[PDB]
């Protein structure tokens, strides 16, 4: 049971290199099943889900190898089943369905029981495929999709915005006969990245990033080299580590345009920011941050995924700031942990009222949420004394060796194994 021991306070400054987005890497990895020729997916982070996906792919008969890049050769897919033994701890598994039936005419994916830690419906995916002409077979714990020949482009109106189903429908539509129009498509920068990857392979797709995605099917996709986009939330997490520590940081391998709202929010906090084609610079000038008002909402507005981070910023800022969750419920569970560190806050309705204090005090903390947990480490860096962040495996799930990045920024951090 790994833990993080942090010695504070320490100013976080210097350089950090941003890892690729797991969330853009996953769907691209699955989409590669469409590729007739070898493919090189660069900038893929070293995370658990990537491994599971690697195993899943190999199981299909795909040739797979990795380092910074992941090499894929899907020329010989022979097996069409994603056994219960894989879709286990990985929702993303579902992404194998579409490419399979779209390219091979048949695909089968395992589905966790009606109520076993993942009763999460995948109805949208299924119905989207059916809409594209796939024959669907459901028996409960398994889902089969098949088609005689090619899938057929369709005008598909989404009743619920879904990053997951948008990927499934868009991916499968590239090999279908005709044009597919996806109304109410998810807008995520990850969707854009996946669409771009598809286009690099020879697909015809437009509207990515808007409410409307249009795909014109082609007979086949080739191979090539594609670089996965920068991790927007990781970038944001680092920018915040600098903004709460009076530091100066430059984020390398970054993508400014996927962070507009977070940047303007940082500026409101008093931060000095500059951006280039592939980098972002933040400078606090030794200054404490100014309390800010935050309203999370659908991309391209302020991302709920940066919430815990900004909550921490407000907590050590000059003045009072309120964070409102306009879409999600129960997103403040971690706050008590911060209060144990000396923070002043009130949780009311879909909001957290932040009364900034001068300095935090170290303590033994723990959060299950990826973002909130990472935030506890950030706090540990600026708090006075020793802070022990427990159960950090949650962080390792979406953060590529974060202790090493922090360290290179000046943090006094230690990965403590066993106990
Ligand atoms: O087939 C589907 C696919 C998605 N949804 C819903 O659509 C919403 C958003 O879809 P996406 O935008 O597809 O959400 P996901 O990325 O599929 O789910 C992720 O985001 C959720 C919080 O929004 C977390 O609870 C999940 O664990 C995480 O995998 C979610 O509330 C889903 O319940 C469905 O009802 N049916």
Curated annotation (Swiss-Prot):
Belongs to the EPSP synthase family. MurA subfamily. Phosphoenolpyruvate binds at residues 22-23. The keyword Cell cycle applies. InterPro entries: Enolpyruvate_Tfrase_dom (IPR001986), Enolpyruvate_Tfrase_sf (IPR036968), MurA_subfamily (IPR050068), RNA3'P_cycl/enolpyr_Trfase_a/b (IPR013792), UDP_GlcNAc_COvinyl_MurA (IPR005750). It comes from the Bacteria. One of its GO terms (cellular component) is cytoplasm. Gene3D superfamilies: Enolpyruvate transferase domain. Cell wall formation. Adds enolpyruvyl to UDP-N-acetylglucosamine. Target for the antibiotic fosfomycin. This is UDP-N-acetylglucosamine 1-carboxyvinyltransferase. It is found in: Cytoplasm. In vitro inhibited by covalent binding of fosfomycin and the fungal product terreic acid in the presence of substrate UDP-N-acetylglucosamine, with an inactivation rate constant of 130 M(-1)sec(-1) for terreic acid. The gene is murA. NCBIfam families: murA (TIGR01072), PRK09369.1 (NF006873). UDP-N-acetyl-alpha-D-glucosamine binds at residues 91, 120-124, 160-163, 305, 327. The active site is at 115 (proton donor). The modification 2-(S-cysteinyl)pyruvic acid O-phosphothioketal is found at residue 115. The keyword Transferase applies.
